Amino acid sequence: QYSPNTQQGRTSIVHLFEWRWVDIALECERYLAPKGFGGVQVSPPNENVAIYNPFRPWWERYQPVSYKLCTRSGNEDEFRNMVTRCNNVGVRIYVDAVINHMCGNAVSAGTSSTCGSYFNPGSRDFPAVPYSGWDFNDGKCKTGSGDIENYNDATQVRDCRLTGLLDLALEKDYVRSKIAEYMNHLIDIGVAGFRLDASKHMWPGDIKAILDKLHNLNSNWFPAGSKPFIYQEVIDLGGEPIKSSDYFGNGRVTEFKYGAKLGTVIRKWNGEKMSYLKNWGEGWGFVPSDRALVFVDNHDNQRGHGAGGASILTFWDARLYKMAVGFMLAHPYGFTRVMSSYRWPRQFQNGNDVNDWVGPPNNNGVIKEVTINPDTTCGNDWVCEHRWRQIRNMVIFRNVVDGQPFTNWYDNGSNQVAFGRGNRGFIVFNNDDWSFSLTLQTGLPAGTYCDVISGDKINGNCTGIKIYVSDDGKAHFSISNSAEDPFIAIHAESKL
Ligand SMILES: C[C@H]1O[C@H](O[C@H]2[C@H](O)[C@@H](O)[C@@H](OC[C@H]3O[C@@H](O)[C@H](O)[C@@H](O)[C@@H]3O)O[C@@H]2CO)[C@H](O)[C@@H](O)[C@@H]1N[C@H]1C=C(CO)[C@@H](O[C@H]2O[C@H](CO)[C@@H](O[C@H]3O[C@H](CO)[C@@H](O)[C@H](O)[C@H]3O)[C@H](O)[C@H]2O)[C@H](O)[C@H]1O
Ligand SMILES: *[C@@H]1O[C@H](CO)[C@@H](O)[C@H](O)[C@H]1NC(C)=O
Ligand SMILES: [Ca+2]
Ligand SMILES: [Cl-]
């Protein structure tokens, strides 16, 4: 299962955070497929609680009310339509699966759900599933408040409520079956895998029990015997009793130390410098590459929530952000996920953003459509990082060099480094406060190459910097510390 199930030649998935199904469907056809993206992680597709205080925050989608495919992103018809269209184009769909819990216990009963389904948090009643008091861990948890109070007790992390979220009793076959019914429904529709939300709060064995009940991927699109791609969200920054290695038997795991460390290195915090990245990978204490799902930032930590803390880089830090995503996409470690966000009015008070709950662009709660500007950027406040030339081209760079070994490393002992991927690609970084100008061994065949960061190879010529590689594989690179993007990347497919 540890396989992404993407089409051979596509090495990344993009998280289109809070996008509408019809928009993702269009994007699959007009951009994702043509540009070589392997897949899309979609926000929870199941019915959630409609929260008006604050006004429709992004996190209301992590408070399930039922498993009906009915949310602000669209209905079941639109969802199935999106999966079909995307698949028929070679772009996979991965579902954000919230199976650990239902909504907050403090939520009011009624029908304030994205689909009118009736629910009653207080009496533990969710008739639309259905679920009742018998399906929650209320009696199982032993904390005085019923919530998770101590992360050093691996037992309450699993049996108690993560910040009040009603905890499902995943050891009961009935509950396991209603969750598998939900997931198989999605698999049969055509989804290629799942992000198991809050995997640290579930026992490795209960997860395994559910995965045993899952179908093989839709044979109309996937070869027989295909298993769904599973990546478990486990925030393991060391120090806790629960280790992400405990989950290797169920599938991959999100490596949160990846973005956190890369963040500090590129920001050059407390001594860190890029020259130290020569042995980036397991050498830094990360999980084995073949069990890693990596990223620079995610929906949680890009807004002071998840893990990484203050070192995390996001679109807000555009220049350093493109450099980290660039390094990630060039380096051989793990399977990469690209983030695509929307802008929100950050309002830092006392060093904290009081507007981090703000939901996606909307009009009276109705999510805005993604509009494409003439330069390919997006309107309506969608940042669309996946459409930034520097990022889009590095997505293609990863596809071109897939399989090539890590070689020809160079560093000045400070923050100017470079390395190639076999004889298929080469990348150079200048993160020092002074210019870089030197001739380096690239390992690429002779010729004139287009730098894919500053420009594009527009059949016959380049729109940006051009690099000339000699017969012995050497080439001169010059990067001012004043460049908009302090790094250059060239590959086999950008060769003139
Ligand atoms: C939010 C996060 O908490 C835990 O992560 C822990 C992690 O285990 C621990 O080692 C450490 O790591 C991380 C690092 O963290 C830094 O900060 C520290 O500085 C570092 O030292 C530390 O190492 O701190 C993290 C955050 O406390 C879970 O283990 C994650 O799985 C979960 N993330 C997923 C799960 C859920 C729940 O469905 C979602 O929550 C989302 O959805 C729920 C439900 O809507 C929202 O809860 C909201 O609704 C509930 C309703 O009851 C209210 O009670 C609550 O106040 C309100 O905010 C929630 O805020 C929202 O993020 C997320 O979007 C989703 O990505
Ligand atoms: C490249 O651009 C130059 C003009 O700057 C033109 O002479 C040349 O024919 C173009 N190459 C191709 C392959 O179109
Ligand atoms: Ca739990
Ligand atoms: Cl994640």
Side-chain angles (χ1 to χ4, degrees), residues 221-243:
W221 285 289
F222 305 83
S226 291
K227 296 193 176 312
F229 179 47
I230 303 293
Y231 48 117
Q232 310 158 89
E233 182 224 6
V234 183
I235 299 179
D236 186 21
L237 300 189
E240 270 170 41
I242 300 167
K243 310 160 299 302

Side-chain angles (χ1 to χ4, degrees), residues 41 195 231 233 254 256 293 295 298-299 337:
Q41 173 182 309
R195 169 193 178 255
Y231 48 117
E233 182 224 6
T254 48
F256 280 85
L293 180 291
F295 45 98
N298 84 335
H299 66 285
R337 182 178 61 193

Side-chain angles (χ1 to χ4, degrees), residues 90-256:
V91 178
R92 311 310 182 196
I93 292 292
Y94 303 95
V95 171
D96 196 334
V98 190
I99 65 184
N100 166 64
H101 58 276
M102 297 306 281
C103 63
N105 71 291
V107 178
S108 305
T111 53
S112 182
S113 42
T114 55
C115 221
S117 284
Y118 172 79
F119 64 107
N120 189 313
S123 63
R124 268 51 172 180
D125 198 52
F126 301 78
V129 172
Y131 282 144
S132 60
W134 301 46
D135 307 310
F136 294 88
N137 289 313
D138 293 302
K140 219 231 242 91
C141 171
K142 305 115 288 69
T143 63
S145 64
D147 288 358
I148 298 177
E149 290 168 36
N150 193 178
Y151 277 66
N152 286 180
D153 168 25
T155 300
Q156 64 167 283
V157 172
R158 273 61 173 278
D159 309 318
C160 303
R161 303 188 296 258
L162 177 62
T163 65
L165 280 327
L166 294 175
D167 215 45
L168 292 170
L170 307 180
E171 85 284 356
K172 295 188 55 183
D173 189 59
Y174 176 71
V175 173
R176 287 171 177 179
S177 293
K178 299 302 290 187
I179 287 178
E181 195 195 322
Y182 167 55
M183 295 175 89
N184 283 335
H185 169 40
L186 293 174
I187 291 173
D188 292 348
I189 283 179
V191 311
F194 310 89
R195 169 193 178 255
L196 299 193
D197 183 61
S199 288
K200 174 192 291 184
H201 302 289
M202 303 183 272
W203 294 90
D206 291 328
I207 293 175
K208 176 75 279 190
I210 294 170
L211 297 183
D212 288 335
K213 295 182 142 69
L214 270 40
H215 296 168
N216 280 162
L217 305 186
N218 197 114
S219 46
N220 286 284
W221 285 289
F222 305 83
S226 291
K227 296 193 176 312
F229 179 47
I230 303 293
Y231 48 117
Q232 310 158 89
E233 182 224 6
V234 183
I235 299 179
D236 186 21
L237 300 189
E240 270 170 41
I242 300 167
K243 310 160 299 302
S244 52
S245 65
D246 299 343
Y247 298 79
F248 290 172
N250 300 318
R252 300 210 182 208
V253 298
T254 48
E255 181 45 287
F256 280 85

Side-chain angles (χ1 to χ4, degrees), residues 16-24 26 30 55-56 61 72-74 341-345 358-372 378-384:
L16 298 181
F17 186 45
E18 291 274 12
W19 280 42
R20 293 159 60 235
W21 307 148
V22 61
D23 284 303
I24 298 176
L26 288 170
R30 76 192 169 203
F55 194 67
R56 318 310 298 286
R61 294 190 81 152
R72 287 206 293 164
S73 281
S341 356
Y342 59 77
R343 308 175 192 289
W344 72 92
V358 183
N362 73 95
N363 289 139
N364 294 282
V366 180
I367 299 177
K368 286 177 182 171
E369 64 192 13
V370 174
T371 54
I372 306 305
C378 296
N380 291 329
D381 295 304
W382 301 97
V383 182
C384 291

Side-chain angles (χ1 to χ4, degrees), residues 41-62:
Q41 173 182 309
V42 297
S43 299
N46 63 295
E47 175 180 35
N48 60 272
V49 175
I51 301 169
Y52 302 87
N53 173 52
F55 194 67
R56 318 310 298 286
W58 62 272
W59 46 256
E60 60 158 47
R61 294 190 81 152
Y62 287 97

